[PDB]
């Protein structure tokens, strides 16, 4: 959620800069400025940040809106500092300083924007999508772009038996590897080979799909989370 702080709040410095953009990463509890994210990608230069966000430099209305966001991230000039900054508020911060950079590098590379890029050489592609999200926010904030409709079905996707069962199949398959790993773990440490016939569990795959499809509760009832009722109803 690339949010934009409201003007309602008042402060000594907050009022001056006014409205600034803050982006919350999936694995970062606190809201970090969006500008710092681009610095972590590799765009140390501030001009490159404006290039990806603001496509039309002739228009000054959008340029003024991004100025306050740069103030918060200005002190962070080097890319390593930006990676260090993000890792500071990570879910599991590393004890050593170098670990914070590594955790931030993995989060932005893998956890953040998986669809645009999953490898380690998609920094340029990831930044462009990130800039577009800010650019989309700027249009809505200025009012030149209408807010997206919540009830618009184009913004909603329908999950049928195919897509639904596809998600479920991963639950048992992921557990299937664990059962094989756990079963082999005691065998491997003893030095003797483990037969696969015992390793693969048929009940999890068979009963796992049959359970939810009958009762109607998706997922795994072993998992400590709230179930989905109302699906796979009696015809």
């Amino acid at each position: 959620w690339v949010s934009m702080l409201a003007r309602g709040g008042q402060g000594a410095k907050k009022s001056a800069i006014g409205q600034r953009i803050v982006a919350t990463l999936p694995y970062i509890k606190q809201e970090v400025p969006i500008i710092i994210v681009f610095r972590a990608l590799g765009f140390v230069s501030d001009r490159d940040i404006l290039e990806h966000i603001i496509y039309d430099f002739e228009d000054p209305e959008m340029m003024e809106m991004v100025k306050p966001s740069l103030d918060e991230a200005f002190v962070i000039q080097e890319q390593n500092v930006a990676l260090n900054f993000i890792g500071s508020r990570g879910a599991k911060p590393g004890v050593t300083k170098e670990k914070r950079i590594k955790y931030a590098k993995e989060v932005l590379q893998k956890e953040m924007l998986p669809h645009v890029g999953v490898s380690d050489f998609c920094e340029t592609k990831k930044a462009y999508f990130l800039g577009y999200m800010v650019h989309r926010l700027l249009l809505a904030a200025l009012g030149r772009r209408e807010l997206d409709d919540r009830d618009h079905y184009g913004n909603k996707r329908l999950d049928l038996a195919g897509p639904l069962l596809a998600f479920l199949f991963r639950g048992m398959f992921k557990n299937l590897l664990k059962e094989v790993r756990i079963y082999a773990q005691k065998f491997i440490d003893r030095g003797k080979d483990f037969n696969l016939e015992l390793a693969i569990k048929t009940r999890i795959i068979s009963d796992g799909l049959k359970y939810s499809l009958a009762t109607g509760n998706w997922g795994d009832q072993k998992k400590a989370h709230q179930a989905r009722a109302g699906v796979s109803q009696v015809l």
């Binding site: 008042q10 000594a12 410095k13 009022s15 001056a16």
Partner: peptide, 19 residues
């Protein structure tokens, strides 16, 4: 310390909101 430039920005928002 917001001598006069940044302070003017801060005071400007205040007088347009809670005045």
């Amino acid at each position: 310390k917001m001598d006069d430039d940044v302070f003017l920005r801060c005071i400007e928002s205040n007088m347009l909101t809670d005045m």
